[PDB]
Design a binder for this molecule. Sequence first.
Ligand SMILES: Nc1ncnc2c1ncn2[C@@H]1O[C@H](COP(=O)(O)OP(=O)(O)NP(=O)(O)O)[C@@H](O)[C@H]1O
Ligand SMILES: Nc1ncnc2c1ncn2[C@@H]1O[C@H](COP(=O)(O)OP(=O)(O)NP(=O)(O)O)[C@@H](O)[C@H]1O
Ligand SMILES: [Mg+2]
Ligand SMILES: [Mg+2]
Lengths: 574, 625
Amino acid sequence: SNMLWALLRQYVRPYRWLLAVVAVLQVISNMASLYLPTVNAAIIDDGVAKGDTARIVELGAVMLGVTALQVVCAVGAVFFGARAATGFGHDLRAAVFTHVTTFSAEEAGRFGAASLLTRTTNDVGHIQQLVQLTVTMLITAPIMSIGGIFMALHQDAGLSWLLLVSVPVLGLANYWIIRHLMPVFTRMQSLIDGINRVLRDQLSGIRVIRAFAREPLERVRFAEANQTLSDSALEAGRWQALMLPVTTLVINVSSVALIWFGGLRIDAGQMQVGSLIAFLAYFMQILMAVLMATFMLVIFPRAAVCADRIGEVLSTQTAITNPADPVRPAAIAGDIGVHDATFCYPGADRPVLQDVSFTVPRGTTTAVVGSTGSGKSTLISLICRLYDVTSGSLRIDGVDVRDLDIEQLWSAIGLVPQRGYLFSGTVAENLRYGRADATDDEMWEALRVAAAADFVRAHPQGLDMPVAQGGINFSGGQRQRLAIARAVIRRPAIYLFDDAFSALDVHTDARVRDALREVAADATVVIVSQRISTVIEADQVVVIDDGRVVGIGTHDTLLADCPIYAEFAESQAL
Amino acid sequence: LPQAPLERTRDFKGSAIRLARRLLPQRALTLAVILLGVGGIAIGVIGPRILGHATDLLFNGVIGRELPAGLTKEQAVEAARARGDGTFADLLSGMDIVPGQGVDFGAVGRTLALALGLYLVAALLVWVQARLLNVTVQRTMVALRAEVQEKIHRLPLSYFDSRQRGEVLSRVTNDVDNIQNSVSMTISQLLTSVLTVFAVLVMMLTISPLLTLFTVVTVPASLWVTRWITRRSQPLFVAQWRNTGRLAAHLEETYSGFTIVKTFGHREAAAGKFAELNSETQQSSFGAQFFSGLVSPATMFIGNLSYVAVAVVGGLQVATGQITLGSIQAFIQYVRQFNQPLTQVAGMYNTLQSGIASAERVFDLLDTEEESADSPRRADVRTGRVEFEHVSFSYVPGTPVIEDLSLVAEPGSTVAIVGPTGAGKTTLVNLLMRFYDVDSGRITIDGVDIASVSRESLRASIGMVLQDTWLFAGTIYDNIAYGRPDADEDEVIEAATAAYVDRFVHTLPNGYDTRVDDDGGAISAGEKQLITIARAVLARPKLLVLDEATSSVDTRTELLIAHAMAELRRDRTSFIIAHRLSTIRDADLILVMDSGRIIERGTHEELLARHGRYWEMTRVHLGGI
Ligand SMILES: Nc1ncnc2c1ncn2[C@@H]1O[C@H](COP(=O)(O)OP(=O)(O)NP(=O)(O)O)[C@@H](O)[C@H]1O
Ligand SMILES: Nc1ncnc2c1ncn2[C@@H]1O[C@H](COP(=O)(O)OP(=O)(O)NP(=O)(O)O)[C@@H](O)[C@H]1O
Ligand SMILES: [Mg+2]
Ligand SMILES: [Mg+2]
């Protein structure tokens, strides 16, 4: 298509003198391979035919030199064709990852964490393999098909018209085949991954499948896809089965016509009988190279859709940027203020938040409450500027967030998101995200607080106990409990808890929420709280409700005034 | 191009025999493929001999025209020898020339006609062979995938836990493709290639054994070079694959935990680690693929050396009169054809080993012991009275989980199970669904036992709500309709409204067409649980069990859900498991359970009366410690 060529011209430009060297090396190698029949014909007509026996043994040296050049010009070509393709893939992968790392939460969520990994890992490999078997297999045809004709002119111009008749007809008969094979091949490719995703969904949700007794219809829906894939494969194979026999038939018919029209000339003496072997080998090599090059031509669209995805990833411009010359407040102390903020997610006609306005002074705890979907997590993200408020103000320590060093805001914001993610490695490595240089006496204290000490201390490896790819070895309530520890080890000026207290039994939840209420005695803490009994000690309470705030105050004042807070208290009374 | 490093097979030949027997039904089709291949290869190898005879006739006529007429061959040779050019006389000696006569074009034409007819038949048989081979391969693959499916649906629920994070996934998706490639190759390319070698060797033996020696000596040399290249590149393929997997894991961790990386200031460290890992994988890929691509030129060099030797020695022989010129043209074509399979013998070996080792894994999966055969009884739960009788269960032999408990769920009553983490609540309700088998107890639903009941008919009337919510990569409407696929677009929306999904559906741009995945789409976990609740309530159950259904849902929307479903779950029992004390309230039969046993039971008032466990728990839940 169009995006693919753009990619190429941008990301193979650093390797032009390697492509230009491969193109020359494979020209020399192909010419050497085609020249062996020429010197064989020279042996036949200047040797055996004339009776000279020393001419054959002296042309054997030329043959040996040609075949010695042909191997070095091929092993030098495969070296540079690899050094160029791997470099191109490496550069493309680095560029894609660098562009992705600049995305904010919204841009990253638009594509999805799973889809971006495929974009940066498999759709770059597809273009890399296209490059490799283009620089090593596609271009074999334009030099073979041209040099063969050139050598035919150099040998016997009066009969070379056979190469100008047979090569175009084979090319046309193969193009007509591939132009029909390509769409069904793409359909088969789009069915293979469909059945793969069907199997993946069946295996992932096996408990769900068995709990709903959907096996009898799951079998039907898998069979109706397997049969469709088989039918598409048969349709694509009944076209592919014509590629080789047609080429062989063309080669053999060309050989027969060559022998006939060559005997016609040799009887008249216009050509020596030795050139028949050379022409036979020319036909075989040229028409084999053409077919082998058209074999790779099937997957252009497969590498074109991948290039389109990569280009759409690379064309997205991040919105949340770092302001030029940001104000640098030394020793940033947590003091938050939200003035008439509103987010209004892309996908508008309903702003998630509207006219939100409150203040959290330093060392005071503010707890936000609201029903599911109210926008508490959106408010938390806005506080740390994962997103940006569209028509409001959000100022930490007086200065607006929008004009402030984003890394300095990152360094002292103590975020514990709702999700909960633990990176691969050891528990100590995960806890080192907060403080890069943390002692074991400090890690155990930070660990201890989150009440997570006595499930890793009972491990044989202690602090170095392994962690899965995404903390999947944990059960939930241990992963998001370690998430609390990795942020409490930071000792930040701001804590931002996003309801990581779920999946915890009563005793552990109480222990954690009482222990972290002590270490955060002097710190700006914003906690997404759900249990009203855990909000009495909070200095301020915010009453988000499906959009804006519907109440601000302490426990008693909000119970007296706010009716939704009263509803929450009544409903979780007993 | 093959790049799979290697695999170890427990028994190569037994697995190969089993894989061959897999395609046993197509015995007639396989035999037809083999015979067509043999016929086509014979006709394709006999043609160059006909072309050699044609050019031999051309040569005889051309160089017999110049000789004086009248004289016969054996005296013309003597006359040429007496002329001093003895080598030309030797050339004339081994020939079929009649002096004074030119080329007979009629014989040449009627020989080329036979050659053309044979080539037409050869080029017509190969296409039919390939078309039949495609059908055979597709039929066998369809059968294998269907039986793999069946085995997957028959496997025990404990096999998927022992297997390590995607082993089963990579055993059926990308492991059957290797079998397909190996099967479609071992009868389409390897067979032709060995038959090509055999037929070519036969024909060149009929032409000249001495020339056959020079071109058969290269097979050991080419094989030695090929296996040396593969042996030296074996440490490279493993390194490339390991580095690729490591880079993919790092990229997945960076993308999934992107918020943590950005927030904790590790973006510039993740970028550095990527810049140090991608550089390593580039080297390990370039080095692994240079050697992989070095195979073809290496064997082509040996083939060209054989070609040079054959050409020189054949020219010497023909100039001496040992063999005819057409016989050396045919030999040149034969050696050119014979050199071909030696180039990708490495390819067939690699794609055969990688794929026989895959068939071994697939057969091992298909040979695992499955679930016990469920007795067809068509469970008839009317009221929903559940009873546990001395139920004991252990996930593995040894350490037990559930130890001799007995609960009685009366019809209509809503039993609520509470306890600390790791008590086994989820296990307790999984035993009710026959996910696992009770060791030394008995579960009775409405009097009848649960073992002598059709497992599907039992699980189709419980409508269980998971603890760890799962949604497939589809739309919200599809996820809700996943319960009953045969429900019109008026009950799915009613269930969504009952579960209050249609309260935040009206917030998204495209409400019911929103593509949602299990890895954090535009839907939060609390809203995600509502989709599961709606899906479970759409497929009308007879007794509900909800394991942490509303863990992430506030205690103001769950009250609305309870009020909306009060009529649905009015005469149906319900086992509610929740760590939140405000959900089990107004629900009789509260079971406090610890370490797999049940400490105490009764309603809320009775439990509060006898201070202990529950009491202490409810004091801890509220203000206190
Ligand atoms: N990427 C998005 N596109 C469109 N709508 C979105 C997106 N992300 C969130 N929303 C909506 O924005 C609203 C606020 O979501 P959210 O802030 O997660 O609620 P919440 O405070 O987290 N309640 P809870 O689910 O209990 O955590 C909801 O109606 C969401 O459906
Ligand atoms: N697949 C399994 N294999 C082995 N042991 C298991 C398995 N699943 C659970 N267990 C163990 O069984 C015990 C209780 O399991 P579980 O059913 O998760 O209790 P639970 O009450 O659901 N915990 P929770 O849901 O977080 O409150 C623990 O000791 C677990 O380690
Ligand atoms: Mg949220
Ligand atoms: Mg559980």
